[PDB]
Structures are given as C-alpha cells and as structure tokens.
Short mmCIF file of C-alpha atoms and ligand atoms in Angstrom, two decimals:
data_model
loop_
_atom_site.label_atom_id
_atom_site.label_comp_id
_atom_site.label_asym_id
_atom_site.label_seq_id
_atom_site.Cartn_x
_atom_site.Cartn_y
_atom_site.Cartn_z
CA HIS A 52 0.00 0.00 0.00
CA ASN A 53 0.98 3.68 -0.30
CA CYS A 54 -0.62 5.14 2.83
CA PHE A 55 1.12 7.10 5.56
CA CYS A 56 1.02 6.41 9.25
CA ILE A 57 0.42 8.35 12.49
CA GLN A 58 2.07 7.75 15.86
CA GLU A 59 1.24 9.27 19.27
CA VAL A 60 4.23 11.16 20.68
CA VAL A 61 2.78 13.16 23.64
CA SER A 62 -0.60 13.62 25.33
CA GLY A 63 -2.12 15.63 28.19
CA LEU A 64 -1.39 18.94 26.48
CA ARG A 65 -3.69 21.98 26.69
CA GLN A 66 -5.16 23.06 23.31
CA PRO A 67 -2.02 22.80 21.16
CA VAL A 68 -1.43 25.42 18.46
CA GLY A 69 1.70 24.10 16.70
CA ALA A 70 5.28 22.99 17.37
CA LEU A 71 8.75 23.85 16.08
CA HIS A 72 12.47 23.49 16.72
CA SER A 73 15.21 25.82 17.90
CA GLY A 74 17.61 25.29 14.97
CA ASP A 75 20.40 25.09 17.53
CA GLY A 76 21.46 21.43 17.23
CA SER A 77 19.61 20.16 20.26
CA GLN A 78 16.71 18.35 18.69
CA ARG A 79 14.37 20.09 21.13
CA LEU A 80 10.76 20.50 20.08
CA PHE A 81 8.86 23.51 21.34
CA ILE A 82 5.09 23.04 21.49
CA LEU A 83 2.64 25.97 21.68
CA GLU A 84 -0.49 25.96 23.83
CA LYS A 85 -3.32 28.44 23.19
CA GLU A 86 -3.64 29.79 26.73
CA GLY A 87 -0.05 31.09 26.38
CA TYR A 88 2.58 28.42 27.09
CA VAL A 89 5.54 27.04 25.16
CA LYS A 90 6.64 23.62 26.44
CA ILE A 91 9.81 21.71 25.49
CA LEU A 92 9.78 18.13 24.26
CA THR A 93 13.13 16.45 24.67
CA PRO A 94 14.44 14.44 21.66
CA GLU A 95 14.49 11.49 24.02
CA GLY A 96 10.77 12.14 24.70
CA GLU A 97 10.38 14.09 27.99
CA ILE A 98 8.17 17.13 28.54
CA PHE A 99 10.03 19.42 30.91
CA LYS A 100 7.87 20.26 33.96
CA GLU A 101 8.87 23.92 33.84
CA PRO A 102 7.57 25.66 30.69
CA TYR A 103 10.01 27.33 28.29
CA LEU A 104 7.67 30.30 27.96
CA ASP A 105 4.87 31.05 30.46
CA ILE A 106 3.11 34.14 29.23
CA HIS A 107 -0.52 33.17 29.93
CA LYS A 108 -1.28 36.25 32.02
CA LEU A 109 -0.35 38.60 29.16
CA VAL A 110 -2.42 36.78 26.54
CA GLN A 111 -6.21 37.02 26.34
CA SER A 112 -6.96 33.47 25.20
CA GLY A 113 -10.61 33.08 24.24
CA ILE A 114 -12.80 30.33 25.56
CA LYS A 115 -15.54 29.86 22.87
CA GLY A 116 -14.05 27.71 20.12
CA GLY A 117 -14.03 29.41 16.75
CA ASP A 118 -12.70 32.11 19.05
CA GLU A 119 -9.16 32.60 17.82
CA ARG A 120 -7.75 34.78 20.59
CA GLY A 121 -4.80 32.90 22.17
CA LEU A 122 -1.09 32.45 21.49
CA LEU A 123 -0.67 32.30 17.71
CA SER A 124 2.92 31.65 16.62
CA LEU A 125 6.56 31.28 17.66
CA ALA A 126 9.70 31.72 15.53
CA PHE A 127 13.38 31.23 16.40
CA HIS A 128 16.25 33.34 15.10
CA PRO A 129 18.43 31.72 12.40
CA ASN A 130 21.25 32.46 14.88
CA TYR A 131 19.41 31.63 18.13
CA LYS A 132 22.34 29.29 18.91
CA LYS A 133 24.38 32.51 19.23
CA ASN A 134 21.93 35.27 20.22
CA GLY A 135 19.07 33.25 21.74
CA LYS A 136 16.27 35.31 20.23
CA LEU A 137 12.61 34.31 20.01
CA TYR A 138 9.70 35.93 18.26
CA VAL A 139 6.18 35.45 19.55
CA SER A 140 2.89 36.62 18.11
CA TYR A 141 -0.04 36.67 20.54
CA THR A 142 -3.32 38.36 21.41
CA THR A 143 -3.56 40.71 24.40
CA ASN A 144 -5.57 43.33 26.30
CA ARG A 145 -4.39 48.53 28.07
CA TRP A 146 -4.86 50.15 24.65
CA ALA A 147 -6.39 53.65 24.47
CA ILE A 148 -5.26 54.93 21.04
CA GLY A 149 -8.38 53.77 19.15
CA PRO A 150 -11.13 51.13 18.76
CA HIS A 151 -10.48 47.46 19.59
CA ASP A 152 -11.61 44.17 21.05
CA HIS A 153 -7.92 43.34 21.49
CA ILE A 154 -4.49 43.90 19.88
CA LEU A 155 -2.43 41.29 18.02
CA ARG A 156 1.11 41.69 19.31
CA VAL A 157 4.53 40.64 17.97
CA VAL A 158 7.24 40.56 20.65
CA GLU A 159 10.90 39.58 20.88
CA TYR A 160 12.06 37.40 23.77
CA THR A 161 15.50 36.16 24.81
CA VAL A 162 16.50 32.95 26.65
CA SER A 163 17.65 33.15 30.23
CA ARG A 164 21.44 33.52 30.14
CA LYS A 165 21.32 31.13 33.12
CA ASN A 166 18.82 28.53 31.89
CA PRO A 167 18.96 27.37 28.24
CA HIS A 168 15.52 25.77 28.72
CA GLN A 169 13.70 28.92 29.82
CA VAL A 170 13.33 32.48 28.50
CA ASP A 171 13.27 35.38 30.93
CA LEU A 172 10.08 37.41 30.54
CA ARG A 173 11.87 40.71 31.32
CA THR A 174 13.36 40.76 27.80
CA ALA A 175 10.03 41.48 26.08
CA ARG A 176 10.49 43.89 23.17
CA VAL A 177 7.24 44.86 21.50
CA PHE A 178 7.84 44.97 17.73
CA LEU A 179 4.32 45.39 16.39
CA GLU A 180 0.90 46.05 17.87
CA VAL A 181 -2.00 45.38 15.52
CA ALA A 182 -5.40 46.62 16.75
CA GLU A 183 -8.09 44.00 16.17
CA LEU A 184 -11.86 44.44 16.08
CA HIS A 185 -13.09 40.85 15.74
CA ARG A 186 -12.26 37.44 17.23
CA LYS A 187 -11.70 35.66 13.89
CA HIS A 188 -9.51 35.84 10.74
CA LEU A 189 -6.53 36.77 12.93
CA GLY A 190 -3.57 34.80 11.53
CA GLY A 191 -0.22 35.71 13.08
CA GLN A 192 2.04 33.02 11.63
CA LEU A 193 5.72 33.98 12.06
CA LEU A 194 8.63 32.67 9.95
CA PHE A 195 12.21 33.40 8.80
CA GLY A 196 12.99 32.95 5.10
CA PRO A 197 16.55 32.60 3.82
CA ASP A 198 18.61 35.81 3.75
CA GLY A 199 17.22 35.97 7.32
CA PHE A 200 14.23 38.34 7.12
CA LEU A 201 11.21 37.78 9.39
CA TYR A 202 7.79 37.29 7.78
CA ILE A 203 4.49 37.91 9.55
CA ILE A 204 1.26 36.59 8.01
CA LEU A 205 -1.69 38.60 9.27
CA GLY A 206 -5.29 37.77 8.41
CA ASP A 207 -8.37 39.79 7.44
CA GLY A 208 -9.28 40.37 11.08
CA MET A 209 -12.70 40.63 9.47
CA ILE A 210 -11.71 44.29 9.00
CA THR A 211 -14.27 46.08 6.80
CA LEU A 212 -14.35 49.43 4.92
CA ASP A 213 -16.90 50.81 7.40
CA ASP A 214 -14.63 50.62 10.46
CA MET A 215 -11.49 51.63 8.52
CA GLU A 216 -12.87 55.05 7.51
CA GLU A 217 -14.92 55.31 10.72
CA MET A 218 -12.01 55.39 13.20
CA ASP A 219 -8.25 55.85 12.75
CA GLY A 220 -7.05 53.73 15.69
CA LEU A 221 -7.00 50.95 13.09
CA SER A 222 -3.96 49.35 11.45
CA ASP A 223 -2.76 49.18 7.83
CA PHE A 224 -1.23 45.79 8.59
CA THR A 225 -4.23 43.39 8.57
CA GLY A 226 -4.64 41.01 5.62
CA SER A 227 -0.97 41.35 4.69
CA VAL A 228 2.37 39.58 4.62
CA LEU A 229 4.95 41.79 6.34
CA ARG A 230 8.70 41.31 5.89
CA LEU A 231 11.11 42.82 8.44
CA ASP A 232 14.84 43.03 9.13
CA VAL A 233 15.31 42.25 12.83
CA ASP A 234 19.10 42.47 12.46
CA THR A 235 19.22 46.19 13.33
CA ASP A 236 22.06 48.16 14.84
CA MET A 237 19.68 51.08 15.39
CA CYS A 238 18.20 51.73 18.83
CA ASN A 239 15.47 54.21 17.82
CA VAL A 240 13.51 51.58 15.88
CA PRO A 241 12.95 47.97 17.06
CA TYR A 242 13.31 46.63 13.49
CA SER A 243 14.84 47.70 10.18
CA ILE A 244 13.23 47.45 6.73
CA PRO A 245 15.30 45.71 4.02
CA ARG A 246 16.14 47.81 0.93
CA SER A 247 14.61 45.05 -1.24
CA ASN A 248 11.11 45.73 0.14
CA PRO A 249 8.36 47.26 -1.96
CA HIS A 250 7.48 50.58 -0.27
CA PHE A 251 11.00 50.78 1.26
CA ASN A 252 10.89 54.58 0.88
CA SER A 253 7.23 55.39 0.05
CA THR A 254 5.53 58.25 1.93
CA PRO A 255 6.10 50.23 4.19
CA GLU A 256 6.51 46.93 6.07
CA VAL A 257 3.78 45.50 3.81
CA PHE A 258 5.27 43.00 1.37
CA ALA A 259 1.92 41.79 -0.05
CA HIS A 260 -1.80 42.23 0.73
CA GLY A 261 -5.09 40.47 -0.08
CA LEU A 262 -5.19 37.73 2.58
CA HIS A 263 -8.48 36.90 4.27
CA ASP A 264 -8.62 33.83 6.52
CA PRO A 265 -5.35 31.92 6.09
CA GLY A 266 -4.54 28.63 7.78
CA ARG A 267 -0.98 27.52 8.47
CA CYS A 268 0.83 28.42 5.24
CA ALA A 269 3.30 26.03 3.61
CA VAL A 270 6.86 27.34 3.32
CA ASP A 271 9.35 26.24 0.64
CA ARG A 272 12.97 27.21 1.30
CA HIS A 273 14.29 25.37 -1.80
CA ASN A 274 14.33 32.23 -3.01
CA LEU A 275 11.23 31.45 -0.94
CA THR A 276 7.72 30.19 -1.64
CA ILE A 277 4.86 30.64 0.81
CA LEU A 278 1.55 29.01 -0.13
CA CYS A 279 -1.63 29.59 1.88
CA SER A 280 -5.05 28.08 2.16
CA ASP A 281 -7.77 30.70 2.75
CA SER A 282 -11.37 30.27 3.89
CA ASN A 283 -12.66 33.68 2.72
CA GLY A 284 -15.47 33.39 5.29
CA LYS A 285 -18.28 31.48 3.59
CA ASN A 286 -16.94 32.08 0.08
CA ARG A 287 -15.28 29.10 -1.64
CA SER A 288 -11.91 27.85 -0.34
CA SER A 289 -8.90 29.07 -2.28
CA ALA A 290 -5.11 28.81 -2.36
CA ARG A 291 -2.88 31.88 -2.54
CA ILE A 292 0.83 31.75 -3.44
CA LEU A 293 3.78 34.08 -2.81
CA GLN A 294 7.17 33.59 -4.52
CA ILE A 295 10.03 36.07 -4.10
CA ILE A 296 12.31 35.03 -7.02
CA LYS A 297 16.11 35.30 -6.65
CA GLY A 298 17.59 38.55 -5.28
CA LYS A 299 15.43 41.30 -6.77
CA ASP A 300 14.64 44.82 -5.56
CA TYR A 301 10.91 45.51 -5.29
CA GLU A 302 9.27 48.92 -5.74
CA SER A 303 5.72 47.80 -6.54
CA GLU A 304 4.03 44.90 -4.70
CA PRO A 305 4.50 41.28 -5.84
CA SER A 306 1.21 39.63 -6.81
CA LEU A 307 -0.34 37.27 -4.27
CA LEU A 308 -1.54 34.87 -6.97
CA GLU A 309 -4.85 33.10 -6.30
CA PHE A 310 -6.09 29.73 -7.61
CA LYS A 311 -8.83 27.28 -6.54
CA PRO A 312 -7.62 23.66 -6.36
CA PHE A 313 -9.63 22.59 -3.27
CA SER A 314 -12.84 20.54 -2.97
CA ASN A 315 -13.25 19.05 0.55
CA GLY A 316 -14.21 22.40 2.12
CA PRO A 317 -12.18 24.19 4.83
CA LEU A 318 -8.53 23.33 5.55
CA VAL A 319 -6.33 23.72 8.65
CA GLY A 320 -3.24 24.50 6.60
CA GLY A 321 -0.20 22.83 5.09
CA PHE A 322 3.53 22.24 5.19
CA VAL A 323 6.40 21.51 2.84
CA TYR A 324 7.96 18.21 3.87
CA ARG A 325 11.75 18.49 3.89
CA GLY A 326 12.24 15.66 6.34
CA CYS A 327 14.30 12.51 6.05
CA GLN A 328 12.36 9.46 7.21
CA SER A 329 10.15 9.64 4.10
CA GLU A 330 11.98 9.70 0.78
CA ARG A 331 8.83 9.87 -1.34
CA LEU A 332 7.24 12.72 0.64
CA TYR A 333 10.37 14.85 0.18
CA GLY A 334 9.60 18.30 -1.22
CA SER A 335 5.85 17.75 -1.19
CA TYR A 336 3.22 20.33 -0.27
CA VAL A 337 0.86 18.67 2.21
CA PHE A 338 -2.41 20.13 3.43
CA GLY A 339 -4.75 18.58 5.99
CA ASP A 340 -8.25 19.41 7.23
CA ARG A 341 -9.83 19.33 10.71
CA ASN A 342 -10.80 15.65 10.37
CA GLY A 343 -7.40 14.47 9.11
CA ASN A 344 -7.86 14.13 5.34
CA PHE A 345 -4.55 14.97 3.66
CA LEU A 346 -3.81 16.34 0.17
CA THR A 347 -0.80 17.18 -1.91
CA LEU A 348 -0.50 20.31 -4.02
CA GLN A 349 1.82 19.36 -6.85
CA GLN A 350 2.96 21.64 -9.68
CA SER A 351 3.25 20.54 -13.31
CA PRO A 352 6.74 21.47 -14.53
CA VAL A 353 5.20 21.74 -18.02
CA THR A 354 1.82 23.46 -17.62
CA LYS A 355 2.59 25.17 -14.27
CA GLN A 356 -0.98 24.44 -12.99
CA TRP A 357 -1.57 23.03 -9.49
CA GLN A 358 -3.17 19.66 -8.72
CA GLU A 359 -4.49 18.07 -5.53
CA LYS A 360 -3.90 14.37 -4.92
CA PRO A 361 -5.32 12.65 -1.84
CA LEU A 362 -3.02 10.94 0.66
CA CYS A 363 -4.36 7.95 2.55
CA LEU A 364 -3.63 6.90 6.10
CA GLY A 365 -3.57 3.25 7.11
CA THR A 366 -2.50 1.10 10.01
CA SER A 367 0.78 -0.82 10.08
CA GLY A 368 1.70 -2.04 13.55
CA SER A 369 1.08 0.27 16.49
CA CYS A 370 1.46 3.08 13.93
CA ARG A 371 -2.14 3.69 13.05
CA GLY A 372 -4.43 4.91 10.26
CA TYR A 373 -6.21 7.36 12.56
CA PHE A 374 -5.76 9.75 15.48
CA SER A 375 -8.13 11.14 18.08
CA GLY A 376 -9.96 14.48 17.98
CA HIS A 377 -9.49 17.32 15.50
CA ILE A 378 -6.38 18.88 14.00
CA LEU A 379 -5.59 22.35 15.34
CA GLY A 380 -2.06 22.84 13.96
CA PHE A 381 1.18 21.28 12.70
CA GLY A 382 4.79 20.70 13.78
CA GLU A 383 8.37 20.17 12.55
CA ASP A 384 11.57 18.50 13.89
CA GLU A 385 15.02 19.99 13.56
CA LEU A 386 15.39 16.83 11.46
CA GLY A 387 12.36 17.94 9.45
CA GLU A 388 9.84 15.25 10.42
CA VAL A 389 6.24 16.47 10.67
CA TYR A 390 3.59 16.33 13.41
CA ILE A 391 -0.08 17.06 13.90
CA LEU A 392 -1.50 18.56 17.06
CA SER A 393 -5.03 17.52 17.91
CA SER A 394 -7.78 18.10 20.46
CA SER A 395 -11.57 17.97 20.91
CA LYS A 396 -14.29 19.51 23.12
CA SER A 397 -14.10 16.21 25.02
CA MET A 398 -10.29 16.28 25.35
CA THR A 399 -10.16 20.05 25.99
CA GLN A 400 -12.32 19.85 29.14
CA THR A 401 -9.83 17.32 30.54
CA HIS A 402 -6.58 18.92 29.22
CA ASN A 403 -5.86 16.09 26.75
CA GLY A 404 -4.33 17.61 23.60
CA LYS A 405 -2.07 15.20 21.68
CA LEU A 406 1.12 15.40 19.64
CA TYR A 407 1.11 12.90 16.78
CA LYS A 408 4.00 12.26 14.38
CA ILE A 409 3.48 11.40 10.67
CA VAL A 410 5.34 8.26 9.54
CA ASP A 411 6.26 6.53 6.26
CA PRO A 412 5.92 2.78 6.95
CA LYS A 413 7.63 2.00 3.64
CA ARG A 414 10.91 3.30 5.10
CA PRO A 415 12.76 2.41 8.33
CA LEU A 416 12.44 4.73 11.31
CA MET A 417 16.17 5.42 11.13
CA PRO A 418 17.47 5.25 7.58
CA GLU A 419 21.28 5.36 7.49
CA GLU A 420 21.17 8.88 5.98
CA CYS A 421 18.85 10.30 8.65
CA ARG A 422 21.21 9.60 11.52
CA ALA A 423 22.14 12.78 13.35
CA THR A 424 23.85 13.51 16.64
CA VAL A 425 22.19 15.66 19.32
CA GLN A 426 24.04 18.82 20.43
CA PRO A 427 22.62 19.69 23.89
CA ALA A 428 21.49 23.31 24.27
CA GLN A 429 24.04 25.55 25.97
CA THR A 430 23.80 28.79 27.96
CA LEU A 431 24.28 31.98 25.94
CA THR A 432 27.94 33.04 25.77
CA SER A 433 27.95 35.75 23.07
CA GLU A 434 29.69 39.04 23.90
CA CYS A 435 26.49 41.12 24.14
CA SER A 436 24.69 38.59 26.36
CA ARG A 437 27.18 38.81 29.26
CA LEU A 438 28.20 42.48 29.08
CA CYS A 439 25.10 44.49 28.03
CA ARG A 440 24.06 46.03 31.38
CA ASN A 441 20.32 46.70 31.36
CA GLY A 442 18.44 47.84 28.30
CA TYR A 443 17.93 45.56 25.32
CA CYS A 444 20.66 43.85 23.32
CA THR A 445 19.90 43.45 19.56
CA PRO A 446 20.23 40.18 17.54
CA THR A 447 23.32 41.57 15.75
CA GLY A 448 25.08 41.95 19.09
CA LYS A 449 24.94 45.75 19.33
CA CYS A 450 23.90 46.84 22.83
CA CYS A 451 21.22 49.54 23.08
CA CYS A 452 21.26 51.66 26.24
CA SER A 453 18.32 52.68 28.41
CA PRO A 454 17.94 56.43 29.19
CA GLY A 455 21.06 57.76 30.94
CA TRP A 456 23.57 55.03 30.04
CA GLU A 457 26.48 55.05 27.56
CA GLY A 458 29.38 52.97 26.24
CA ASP A 459 29.62 49.88 24.01
CA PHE A 460 27.76 47.78 26.59
CA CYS A 461 26.07 50.56 28.60
CA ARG A 462 28.37 50.31 31.63
CA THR A 463 29.09 54.03 32.08
CA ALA A 464 26.32 56.12 33.67
CA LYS A 465 25.28 59.62 32.63
CA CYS A 466 25.23 62.65 34.96
CA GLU A 467 23.42 65.44 33.04
CA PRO A 468 25.16 68.17 34.99
CA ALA A 469 28.38 66.34 35.92
CA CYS A 470 29.34 65.27 39.47
CA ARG A 471 31.82 67.52 41.24
CA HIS A 472 34.64 67.49 43.81
CA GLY A 473 35.62 63.95 42.82
CA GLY A 474 32.07 62.55 42.91
CA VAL A 475 31.24 59.36 41.01
CA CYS A 476 28.29 58.95 38.63
CA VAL A 477 26.91 55.60 39.82
CA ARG A 478 23.35 55.51 38.42
CA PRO A 479 21.91 57.92 35.83
CA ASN A 480 21.96 61.37 37.46
CA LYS A 481 23.08 59.95 40.81
CA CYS A 482 26.41 61.11 42.25
CA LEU A 483 28.36 59.31 44.94
CA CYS A 484 30.00 62.14 46.83
CA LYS A 485 33.16 62.12 48.95
CA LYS A 486 32.68 63.01 52.63
CA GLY A 487 31.94 66.70 53.17
CA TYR A 488 30.47 67.41 49.75
CA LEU A 489 26.69 67.66 49.70
CA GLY A 490 24.03 68.24 47.03
CA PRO A 491 22.91 66.46 43.81
CA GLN A 492 26.39 66.98 42.26
CA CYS A 493 28.47 67.28 45.45
CA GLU A 494 28.73 71.01 44.73
CA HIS A 495 28.58 72.17 48.35
CA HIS A 496 31.08 72.22 51.20
CA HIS A 497 30.99 73.62 54.76
ZN1 ZN B 596 -9.54 60.62 10.70
#
C-alpha cells in the first residue's frame, strides 16, 4: 500500500497550536499551547515540567471555540544558537489609542542567560501592535525565510471598509504579509526594513496584501515560496501563493496569486515536507483538514498548474491509520519530520491535547542517511549577552542603552550636569560624593 502512518508522541497537552524546533542542534521541540505556554519536548521524549515560555497572564486566550484569541505563533532566530532570540505573536488586552476588542502583538524574547531551557520574561520587546476588532480571521504566523528576514502573516481580522474610515485607531497591517529586518544596529527603531522591500521609501513593512482567513501556510525554502489556504469566510476555499524570485529589488508589490484547487471544504493549513524518514514525501506540499484528510498540491513542470492528490492513512503495527480528535495545527523537527497537534471539546475539558507524528511505513524509522547527533542546548555566551548592562541587546550583538547610560555595553552612567569634587556617577543622574560634599552633584562644602 501507499498510505502514511500516524504515531502518538505526547498527550495531556492543553489546546495545542503548533510545534517547532530551535535550529540550535539540540533536537528540542517547542510546542505551543493556546492559553499562552511554550513547552519543550526532549528528543528522548520528555516534557520538561517547567515551561520554556509562560506568558498566559499577558495573553487574552478566548474560551468559545471558533474564538481565535490565544497564542498564535513562535519563531526562532536563524542564529538563536548565538543570540538566543525568540519571536512570539499573541493576542492581548491597556490600549487607548483607538477602537479594539484586542491587539495582536509581535514581541521579541530572549532565553535566560542562566537557563537554556527557559526564556526570561523581562526581555520582552514589542515589535508590532495590531489593533483587532473581531475574534476571527486573525492569523499571526511567524517565519524566517533565507537571507534571514522575518515574515508575519496577518489575516483579514474581518476588518471592513466601514470601520477603517470610521475610526483611525485601526492598522494598515491586517490582511498582509509583512517582511522585516530584525538584524538592526539602530536603537530608535525595534526593526529595520530591508532595501529590497516594496514601499521601502514610500511616503512600508507590507510585502503583499489580499489575505483573508489563512490557515498555516506552507513554506518552501528550496528564493522562498509561501503558499496559503484561505477560507474567505463562507466564500469558496482558495489557495494563494507568494514567490520572491532570486535577489530582486521591489518597488511595486508582488502579486499574491490566487487559484482554486480545493474541494473538501475548509482546511487547517499545510507544510512543505523536507524531512528525512520519508523519501517519497520529500519536497511535497501537504495540506490537511480538521478531520485528518490529507492532500498534496503538486505543480506541473510543463503546464505550471496546481493539482491536488489525496493521501491515505492506514494502520501498520502500532502506527495507526487514525488519530483522536481534530487537527488544530502542525509541527516540525530539527530533522524535518512532521507532526499534527489535535484536540476535541471532550479532550479540551480534561486537558488532553495530543502530539502525533506522521510516519512513512515503507521506510525504516532510522534510515542510514537520517542519523544525526544531538548537540545539547548551551547557555548563551555571546559578547552582548554577558556584558550588556540593562536595556535591550539586539540580535546583531549591538547593545542599546536605556535612558542615561552610555558605552559599548552601557556600563558608564550619565550625569546630566556632571558630578563635582571627585564625585562618582553611579546611576543615571546619581552622584556618589566624597565626605563633606553635599548636594545632587556634590557642589557644596561647609
Ligand atoms: Zn480621521
């Protein structure tokens, strides 16, 4: 037979959202939970008791179901092994600059210099705040293409022309793919915009628009290709594709080409398999729906049209043709193997979300070629991590100072009118005076 195969990896999770890897050599797997947790799965199969990221108080994670309001996406820096930088997109509640139900946030975190299995929450750097009016069509998928730019895939938000021209506390960002350069040396702006962006100068972060209700978009690293499903509310069910070509400066927007290859209604999303266990699946675009029907989008090299071809599941040994509940998201190994994350109203009430791995029974679990050696995660050691006083330290390694600090790593304090009579500037605008010199700058004696 030619079916694939699913295997239970982990259970007892709370509403899983997705899972990814650190890219750091430790084959850690970080799994997202909707209430606002990122847990670590060890390559040997242990869930660490302490979460990697516990941010549940900051995130307004909606109850309902169909309610989309939780933690949305995580992305690791291509040089996290050096700089230890995360990017999280989540939904939060105090905004007073316009109308909202909530605001979709994009924040940068950094691992604890002391614990490689936990980030310290004090490192939060808000990158983007996107005012949202509705509790659907949110999106928020984060990803790094090659050349190292960060992509954010924001949905419709169900944002309509009425509310756009009604109030101004509304964002330009919804329904768009945004591409950013996090590798800034600037300290005035949290992120730089690459010169190869369309609207790089225009009187900007928007790389493409048109998106409505996208699932998890498939990402081909090969130039980059991102391919999205889209629900469009109750209006068909289409695929939209973005390709960037090979090193080209944009001044007008690339087309977000639409086509309609789907038939089995709404889809959760897809992935590009670049794993190792399955030879045949290599380089395939896979999309699954809520109930676990899988497809393949394949492109004719001749008549560049897209075609869907069903994939079957089937049991072979304890690796089974089915899984429990409904698919909520997808996952990937550092080795590139792919997972589905499931739950149900029955297994939500009990905290029983599952991680399931997809398997090719036609191949061995460890083909000779797929052998890799685990490189256990280490504590940050980079220059900026150890020296940069307080105030954020950018992914490039440049150390940005908080008000009233100066120097390469912000070690020297600033005294606006300088200290006198041999005083020492200890904190910003604080002088440590020698005995018998009083006042804010030690300017007095008698
Ligand atoms: Zn106005």
